[PDB]
Amino acid sequence: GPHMADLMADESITRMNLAAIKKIDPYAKEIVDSSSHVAFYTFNSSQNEWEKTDVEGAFFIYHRNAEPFHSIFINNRLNTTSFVEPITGSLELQSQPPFLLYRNERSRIRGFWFYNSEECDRISGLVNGLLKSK
Amino acid sequence: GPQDPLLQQQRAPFPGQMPNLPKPPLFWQQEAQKQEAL
Numbered sequence: 001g002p003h004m005a006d007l008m009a010d011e012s013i014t015r016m017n018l019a020a021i022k023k024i025d026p027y028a029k030e031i032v033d034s035s036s037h038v039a040f041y042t043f044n045s046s047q048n049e050w051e052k053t054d055v056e057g058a059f060f061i062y063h064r065n066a067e068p069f070h071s072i073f074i075n076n077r078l079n080t081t082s083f084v085e086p087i088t089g090s091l092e093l094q095s096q097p098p099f100l101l102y103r104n105e106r107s108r109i110r111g112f113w114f115y116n117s118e119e120c121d122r123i124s125g126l127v128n129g130l131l132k133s134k
Numbered sequence: 135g136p137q138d139p140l141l142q143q144q145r146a147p148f149p150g151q152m153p154n155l156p157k158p159p160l161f162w163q164q165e166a167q168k169q170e171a172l
Contacts, residue, residue, distance in 0.1 A: 041155065045163060050155045099155055107170035109163075113153060 024082040025073055028062035033126055035059040035119050043109040055083050061126060070130055089131055100124055
């Protein structure tokens with residue numbers, strides 16, 4: 001009676017994802033990880049509150065065999081807009097469950113919200129490796 | 135425009151409702167600012 005979902009995913013799905021990616025970033029060749037749904041949040045210290053940004057999209061990490069070595073992209077589904085940013089090796093990360101927190105230039109605070117906390121964990125692990133490996 | 139119900143039985147989906155992030159104690163904010171500052 002009970003049935004478990006297949007852990008392995010079809011290769012066709014992976015190919016399709018990379019196809020959409022190329023549409024915005026011609027130099028994205030491989031996908032490292034993808035989160036079904038991720039949103040960008042910023043913190044304003046003056047007010048002591050969190051403000052949601054206009055970027056709500058599927059989050060993908062792209063790998064390339066040329067500079068930049070690694071870059072992160074969010075496909076904004078609601079606004080049909082592309083937002084890209086390169087990965088630097090000076091960023092410091094922190095994990096406050098279930099929301100991921102990181103620090104940015106000029107003492108600013110920004111974080112990422114994921115549909116599932118575990119899903120966020122996997123993505124974060126990748127970034128940590130890049131920071132310590134190059 | 136829509137008015138949320140005062141009493142709720144089960145958690146239902148509501149399009150347009152922003153999630154509420156948890157706020158840490160003041161110490162967290164201060165610590166971050168200092169580390170970045172030199």
